[PDB]
Each structure stands twice: as structure tokens, then as C-alpha cells.
Design a protein around this ligand. Sequence first.
Ligand code: HEM
Length: 179
Amino acid sequence: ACSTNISPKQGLDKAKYFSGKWYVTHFLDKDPQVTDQYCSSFTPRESDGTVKEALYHYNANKKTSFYNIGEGKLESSGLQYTAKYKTVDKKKAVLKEADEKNSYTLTVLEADDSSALVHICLREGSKDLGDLYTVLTHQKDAEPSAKVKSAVTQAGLQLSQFVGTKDLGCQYDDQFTSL
Ligand code: HEM
């Protein structure tokens, strides 16, 4: 099951989260139903409580990439949204529209000018498929801020227990994520 004690940090300036693009420097997957390791980057934007984000995954083992577009509504709680998502090709052509069974809930635990910490619960129907914490930065392999490192320790986690993506030979598609 996804981790239970997850609520958005109150007082967060949303302009810092919905900013630039994010690259995942570190991830923590509690119970990886696969052993393949991924890199990821995404570009979150918000307008009138609606979030839209182009999302990229790179499978570091197979060296393949897949693409999605998430769309969700901000909760009344703060920087937290449940997104449904399209599946697209690298040109953003829709392969599958969003549906009412598949979603993810993203919760911003910290965000500052250079870095973020977010939690993501991926669900399909009645099932939590996967729980992830991800440390984010605005450029590939940038060092996460002290503030975000402190947020990891505040979340009850050890940053050392995360998988660091730098060693994975990540490839990104910065054209896909632009816009
Ligand atoms: C390095 C960080 C991440 C890793 C390691 C990771 C890992 C994974 C894995 C293993 C899957 C299952 C893929 C499959 O076999 O079909 C997946 C799917 C998914 N992830 Fe991530 N992910 C990362 C970051 C993110 C982020 C930042 C988001 C959203 C902002 C996200 C949202 C999703 C969604 C929506 C799917 C389902 C795609 C589908 O069913 O086609 N992930 N991720």
C-alpha cells in the first residue's frame, strides 16, 4: 500500500513547485514490483486549480522511454493533486486517453528555488500499485538543496537509502518536456 502519513507542506509557494522542469535525482520505491530502474523528468503547470504535466520515464536497464500527460485538480489541502493521465508517443500523439481507473496522487513535501521533495502514489482501481518518494532538481545532476535534504530526514527517511539516478546513465528528452 502507499505510505499513509502524506500531506502537503503548508505555506509552500506554488510558484516554486510549478517552475521550470524537474529531474529526479533520487527515488525511494518501497516495494519495486520490477527491478528495472528508471530516470524521470516532468514539467508541472497549474491554472485555476487544474494541473497539467508532461511526464517522461527512461528505463535505465532496457534503455527505452515512455511518455504521459497528467491532469489533475489541486486539493483544498495545498500542493496535492490526484491526476489521471494520457499515454502518448514522443510527439505527444495520444495512444490512450485518460480514464477513470488509473490515477496518481502527487503530494509536495518541500519545494524551494532549486529543489523539491514529492511523494507519488500510483493506483489502478482498488489497488495501490506503487509508492515513490522523489527528490527533484531543475537541471540534470544538480545537487539537491539543504532544505530538501532536511525534508527527507523530516519525512522519516534516509536519503542514502534512495536510488541516486546519476549512476544510471539516464537519457532525457528535453524536447518532449519543453512546454
Ligand atoms: C525516477 C523516478 C521514477 C521511477 C523510478 C518510476 C518508476 C515507474 C515504474 C517502474 C512504472 C511502471 C512502468 C511499467 O512497467 O509499465 C511507472 C509508471 C508510472 N509512473 Fe513512474 N517513476 C518515476 C517517477 C514518476 C513521476 C515523477 C511521476 C509523475 C509525476 C510518475 C508517474 C507514473 C505514471 C502515471 C505511471 C504509469 C504509466 C503507465 O501505466 O503507462 N512516475 N513509474
